[PDB]
Scaffold this motif. Structure first.
Motif: not given
Length: 167
Positions: A123-129, A35-38, A45-52
Motif C-alpha cells: 500500500p501507499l505508506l502513511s496514506a488512509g488513516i 503491511n501498514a503497521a504501527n 484498522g486500515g490496511v493492517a486491520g484488513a490483512l489481519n
C-alpha cells in the motif's frame, strides 16, 4: 516475468493498480506483502486491520509474540514476519502517522525498507488513516524505492487522482 496483472507502469520499477490489497495478496501469493503497521503491531484498522482479519487473527497472534520478545518498532522501521495465507512474508513497515504528530520526513526512511526486497506488493505508506497526502506518499515511493513495487490503491477515486496527477 512475474504474476502481477492489470497494473499501470509509473516508472522503471513502480507499478500501480486500483485493488484491495487483501484480494490481490490472496490471488498472487507474492513473496512479500507490505503491511501498514504501527510500532506496537496492533492491527486494528486500515490496511493492517484488513490483512489481519484475512489471516483469521493469526497475524496479530504472531505479532504479539514478536513485540513481547523485541519491544516496539521504530517509526520508519520494519520487521519481517510470516505472510500467513496471503504471502510468503509480511514486511510490517511503520510510516509516520500524521494523526499522532510524527515527522513526515520519516516517510522516506519507511520506504527505504522496501529496498531490502526484490519484489513487493504494498500500500501507499502513511496514506488512509495514517493521515498523509497519498500524492506525496507516491512521490516519496518513486524517489526512494529502487526494487520492484506493485502498489494497491483501494479507493478508485484516489487511484484515478494519483495517476492523473503523476509527474
Amino acid at each position: 516475468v512475474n504474476s502481477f496483472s492489470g497494473y499501470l507502469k509509473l516508472t522503471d520499477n513502480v507499478y500501480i493498480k486500483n485493488a484491495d490489497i487483501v484480494e490481490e495478496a490472496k490471488k498472487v501469493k507474492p513473496t512479500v506483502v507490505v503491511n501498514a503497521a504501527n510500532v506496537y503491531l496492533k492491527h486494528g484498522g486500515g490496511v493492517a486491520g484488513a490483512l489481519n482479519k484475512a489471516t483469521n487473527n493469526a497475524m496479530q497472534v504472531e505479532s504479539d509474540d514478536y513485540i513481547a520478545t523485541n519491544g516496539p518498532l521504530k517509526v520508519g522501521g520494519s520487521c519481517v514476519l510470516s505472510g500467513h495465507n496471503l504471502a510468503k512474508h509480511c514486511l510490517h513497515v511503520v510510516g509516520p502517522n500524521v494523526n499522532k504528530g510524527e515527522d513526515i520526513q520519516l516517510l522516506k526512511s519507511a520506504y527505504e525498507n522496501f529496498n531490502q526486497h526484490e519484489v513487493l506488493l504494498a500500500p501507499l505508506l502513511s496514506a488512509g488513516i495514517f493521515g498523509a497526502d497519498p500524492i506525496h506518499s507516491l512521490r516519496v515511493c518513486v524517489d526512494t524505492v529502487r526494487t520492484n513495487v506493485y502498489l494497491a490503491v483501494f479507493d478508485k477515486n484516489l487511484y484515478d487522482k494519483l495517476v492523473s496527477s503523476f509527474l
